Amino acid sequence: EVKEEDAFYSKKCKLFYKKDNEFKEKGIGTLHLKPTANQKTQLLVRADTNLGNILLNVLIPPNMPCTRTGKNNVLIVCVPNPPIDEKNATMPVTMLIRVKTSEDADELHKILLEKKDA
Numbered sequence: 001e002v003k004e005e006d007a008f009y010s011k012k013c014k015l016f017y018k019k020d021n022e023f024k025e026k027g028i029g030t031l032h033l034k035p036t037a038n039q040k041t042q043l044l045v046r047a048d049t050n051l052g053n054i055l056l057n058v059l060i061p062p063n064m065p066c067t068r069t070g071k072n073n074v075l076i077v078c079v080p081n082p083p084i085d086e087k088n089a090t091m092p093v094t095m096l097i098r099v100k101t102s103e104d105a106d107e108l109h110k111i112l113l114e115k116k117d118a
Contacts, residue, residue, distance in 0.1 A: 006032075006034045007032035007033055007034040007044075008033060008034065009031070009032075009033040009107075009108075009111055010030060010031065010032050010033070011030065011031060011099065011104050011108070012029075012030045012031075012048065012099075012100070013029075013030065013031055013097045013098060013099050013100075013104075013108075014028050014029075014097070014098050015027060015028075015029070015045065015055055015056060015095060015096075015097065016095065016096040016097075016098070017080060017084060017093050017094065017095050017096075018093060018094035018095075018096075019084065019085075019093075023096060026055060026056070026080075026095075027047055027048075027049075027053075027055045028047070028048040028049065029045050029046050029047040029048045029049075029055045030045065030046050030048060031043075031044070031045050031097070031108075032044045032045065032046060033111070033115070036059070039118065040059055040060060041059075041060045041115040042057075042059055042060075043056065043057070043058050043059065043060055043078075044056075044057050045057070056080060056081060056095075057081050058078055058079055058080075058081045060078075060112070060115055060116055061078070061116070062116065063116075064076065064077060064078060064112075064116050065077050066109060066112065066113060068105070068106075068109050069096070070105075071102040071105070072098065072099050072100075072101065072102035072104070072105045073096060073097070073098055073099075073105060074096065074097045074099070074105050074108055074109050075094060075095065075096050075097075076095055076097075076112065077092050077093075077094060077095075078092050078093075078095060079091075079092045079093075080092070080093050080095070
């Protein structure tokens with residue numbers, strides 16, 4: 001039987017932001033998608049390491065572009081919280097999520113589209 005959990009979509013993955021035409025590992029952790037007080041979806045990512053620190057906590061906006069790269073890779077434009085850049089703080093940054101199975105990637109991208117739809 002399937003256990004109960006707040007987050008409907010939970011899978012391990014690695015975050016990576018684009019800085020100076022390069023990708024830097026933000027921090028290994030697991031993504032947790034769960035509904036918020038509002039009709040919107042809240043995005044949260046817990047650190048894989050023992051230390052349970054928030055890697056990225058933001059709210060899926062109404063307008064968000066999607067970019068599916070490779071087979072098991074996924075890219076999305078969103079505001080990093082906390083923000084890495086001080087000047088571009090307001091402006092979002094490119095983030096890439098590398099999953100274990102190319103299957104998880106597709107699903108992850110698909111869901112998002114639906115989440116942003118409503």
